């Protein structure tokens, strides 16, 4: 499923990723934007030969297991695939273990990289949420 924006965003305050551990929703649909473009089928292989998986492209050398990947410790405890799911759920429950891990958003290389330090409430703009 390819999210709209505030269709994002709505599902995923709903779901309580708002504010969580201090972010706020525009960080969180940012940093989706940049790691999926919305799209939570999305998937790509990292050089370690692990993969990430769904809207915020999380990795399966920690969180998820996917079968394939050397060192893998599933510490969300969900096949990989479950985050590729139209219902965001998993993603987010995930998610907040690892923004919960220490480094808070700086998890996300996108994040870092496109969201951090810039205005991200624009990202929420227009929505009713
Ligand atoms: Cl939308
Ligand atoms: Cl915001
Ligand atoms: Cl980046």
């Not at 969300?76 to 429950?93: H, Q």
């Amino acid at each position: 499923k390819v999210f709209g924006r505030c269709e994002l965003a709505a599902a995923m305050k709903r779901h309580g990723l708002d504010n969580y551990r201090g972010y706020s929703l525009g960080n969180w649909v940012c940093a989706a934007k940049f790691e999926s473009n919305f799209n939570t089928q999305a998937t790509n292989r990292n050089t370690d030969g692990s993969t990430d998986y769904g809207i915020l492209q999380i990795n399966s050398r920690w969180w998820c297991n996917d079968g394939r990947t050397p060192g893998s410790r599933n510490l969300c405890n969900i096949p990989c695939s479950a985050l590729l799911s139209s219902d965001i759920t998993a993603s987010v429950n995930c998610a907040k273990k690892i923004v919960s891990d220490g480094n808070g958003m700086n998890a996300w290389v996108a994040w870092r990289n496109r969201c951090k330090g810039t205005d991200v409430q624009a990202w929420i703009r227009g929505c009713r949420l």
